[PDB]
């Protein structure tokens, strides 16, 4: 299994070595500038990256039952609440709704214990996901419409 | 590909004096000069200020006017194609006008008519004359009027209390040279007196 | 422009920046669109009271017109006993928008009250009743108005991002990227291939001249 290290030059995707190396792998996992700036150690842009074969990871047999689930629950919601802040830049967050503020405090969360990993905090993918549905079960067990059923029934209740 | 960057184009224009560049957009409209007057540029204008000043003092005049109003139409242009033809100052109103005459009336030219195949000097100064001095009497409305309403707002006004002037300044071009050079000097002074006297009438009218 | 790598750079980082933007004052325009609709339907809806509230004044009127006959009008015009009609104002904020917001006498503070009519306790009740009802419908008019200039202001800008500046950038982009890779790169090559031929034409010029001898 190979994870090369590339470094894109100009900080653009449009530079032969990475372009090239695009088409013959299967994913990628950018490095965000402004997730630095932001004092965020690992800098992953999660939303931009992504495997293009993440599916065969995610089963039964490996790892646990619900982890597409909540990946694409917790994929959506970012998505929501990076939308929802842009909103509150020009709508004065005086007008947001409810979930507005949910999705806000979610990507806060997120952003600042979920993705901000220390050097040396090994986490094993149980724990992993133990923190994603602590994030997850801020929101309405009826809300989590990307999540399937019977998955909201076993986990949602902590 | 029409851009000027070509190495040919680039050196000729390093050499060149006087350059009539062409663009693309006005020969698509059917304008037929198709001169983009934004970009061409004539470094004899100095040489011949001893024929302009022995021919006619106001030329050198006019022409830095019109200058002016082609330059204030194209920010005006620019500004429009976002802002909206709306909360235009009636001073930019009148600007705008006048600016439309003298592109499709003086630098307009069919090239295939018994009048426009051929058009002498004076006759050019003439239509240059007769459009500044609409500009500026235009203006001149636009500064005084008895109240702001009825000095700059009233171009609407004018477009009908003056209509006729205003179509004959368009119109005037259309008189070929080869009628009487002093048949078409004689109409354009008596057009310039016509328009002079029913503008000077209407602000000195009401106001 | 020049074309060049910085600024191929620089217009791609322009072209996103506006198309962030553009999606920006979409949403903005939406929200304020929904606000309007919003207000519409709430004026449509007090539009009825201007009828109901109508109705019950003009009932009271016959009633005080059927007890005292003719109302004394005149000094102190009669017909009711509140509204010492005095208005006040205030700005709410609903997405950026400064929507007024409209208080006033027998709705609202600055109001008084002195003796009255026969029925004037009823054309109060009727008469200044329709006073709550006409300032609801006179703020919700206002609002409706600003609303409205406010999205027609939006609408104009979001629309002229997409059709003007958006459509005026690509074509930049792409005449930039049509002249660095279009001509300097294949300049480069055959700079380049003209030297190797250079190369070797000199290599199979010694040749010759080390076998003729």
């Given at each position: 299994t190979q994870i090369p290290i590339l470094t894109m030059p100009n900080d653009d995707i449009t530079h032969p070595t990475p372009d090239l190396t695009g088409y013959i792998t299967e994913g990628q996992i950018y490095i965000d500038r402004q997730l630095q700036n932001r004092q965020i150690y690992?800098?992953?842009?999660?939303?931009?990256?992504?495997?293009?074969?993440?599916?065969?990871?995610?089963?039964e047999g490996m790892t646990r039952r619900d982890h597409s689930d909540v990946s694409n629950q917790l994929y959506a919601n970012y998505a929501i609440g990076k939308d929802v802040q842009a909103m509150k830049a020009v709508?004065?967050?005086?007008?947001?709704?409810?979930?507005?503020?949910?999705?806000?405090?979610?990507?806060?969360?997120?952003?600042?214990?979920?993705?901000?990993?220390?050097?040396?905090?090994?986490?094993?993918?149980?724990?992993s996901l133990d923190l994603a549905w602590t994030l997850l079960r801020i929101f309405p067990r009826e809300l989590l419409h990307r999540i399937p059923?019977?998955?909201?029934?076993?986990?949602?209740?902590? | 590909?029409?851009?000027?960057?070509?190495?040919?184009?680039?050196?000729?224009?390093?050499?060149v004096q006087v350059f009539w560049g062409l663009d693309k957009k006005l020969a698509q409209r059917k304008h037929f000069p198709s001169?983009?007057?934004?970009?061409?540029?004539?470094?004899?204008?100095?040489?011949?200020?001893?024929?302009?000043?022995?021919?006619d003092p106001d030329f050198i005049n006019i022409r830095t006017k019109a200058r002016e109003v082609l330059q204030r139409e194209d920010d005006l242009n620019e500004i429009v194609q976002l802002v909206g033809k709306d909360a235009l100052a009636e001073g930019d109103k009148i600007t705008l006008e006048t600016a439309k005459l003298l592109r499709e009336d003086y630098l307009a030219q069919n090239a295939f008519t018994p009048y426009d195949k051929f058009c002498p000097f004076y006759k050019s100064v003439w239509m240059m004359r007769n459009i500044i001095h609409f500009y500026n009497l235009a203006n001149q409305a636009v500064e005084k009027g008895a109240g702001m309403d009825g000095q700059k707002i009233t171009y609407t006004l004018i477009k009908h209390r003056l209509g006729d002037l205003f179509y004959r300044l368009v119109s005037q071009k259309f008189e070929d040279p080869a009628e009487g050079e002093p048949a078409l000097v004689a109409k354009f002074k008596k057009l310039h007196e016509d328009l002079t006297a029913g503008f000077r009438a209407l602000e000195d009218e009401t106001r | 422009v020049v074309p060049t790598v910085t600024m191929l750079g620089v217009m791609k980082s322009r072209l996103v920046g506006a198309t962030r933007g553009h999606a920006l004052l979409k949403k903005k325009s939406d929200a304020?669109?929904?606000?309007?609709?919003?207000?519409?339907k709430n004026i449509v809806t007090t539009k009825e009271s201007m009828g109901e509230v109508m109705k019950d004044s003009s009932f009271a009127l016959i009633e005080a017109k059927y007890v005292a006959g003719e109302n004394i009008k005149h000094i102190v015009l009669e017909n009711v006993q509140n509204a010492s009609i005095k208005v006040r104002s205030r700005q709410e904020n609903i997405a950026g928008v400064k929507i007024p917001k409209f208080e006033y006498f027998t709705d609202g503070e600055t109001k008084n009250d002195l003796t009255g009519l026969a029925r004037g306790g009823q054309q109060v009740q009727q008469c200044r009743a329709a006073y709550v009802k006409a300032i609801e419908?006179?703020?919700?008019?206002?609002?409706?108005?600003?609303?409205?200039?406010?999205?027609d202001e939006a609408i104009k800008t979001t629309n002229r991002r997409v059709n003007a500046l958006e459509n005026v950038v690509k074509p930049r982009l792409e005449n930039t990227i049509t002249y660095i890779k279009g001509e300097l790169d294949e300049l480069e090559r055959e700079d380049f291939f003209r030297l190797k031929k250079i190369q070797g034409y000199k290599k199979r010029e010694i040749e010759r001249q080390l076998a003729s001898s």
């Open positions: 690992p800098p992953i842009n999660v939303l931009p990256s992504l495997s293009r074969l993440m599916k065969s990871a995610i089963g709508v004065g967050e005086e007008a947001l709704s409810s979930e507005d503020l949910l999705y806000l405090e979610f990507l806060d969360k997120f952003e600042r214990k979920f993705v901000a990993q220390g050097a040396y905090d090994s986490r094993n993918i149980f724990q059923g019977k998955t909201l029934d076993q986990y949602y209740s902590r | 590909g029409g851009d000027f960057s070509d190495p040919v184009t680039s050196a000729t224009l390093s050499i001169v983009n007057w934004l970009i061409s540029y004539s470094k004899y204008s100095t040489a011949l200020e001893s024929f302009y000043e022995q021919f | 304020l669109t929904v606000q309007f609709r919003q207000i519409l419908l006179l703020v919700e008019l206002a609002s409706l108005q600003t609303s409205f200039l406010t999205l």
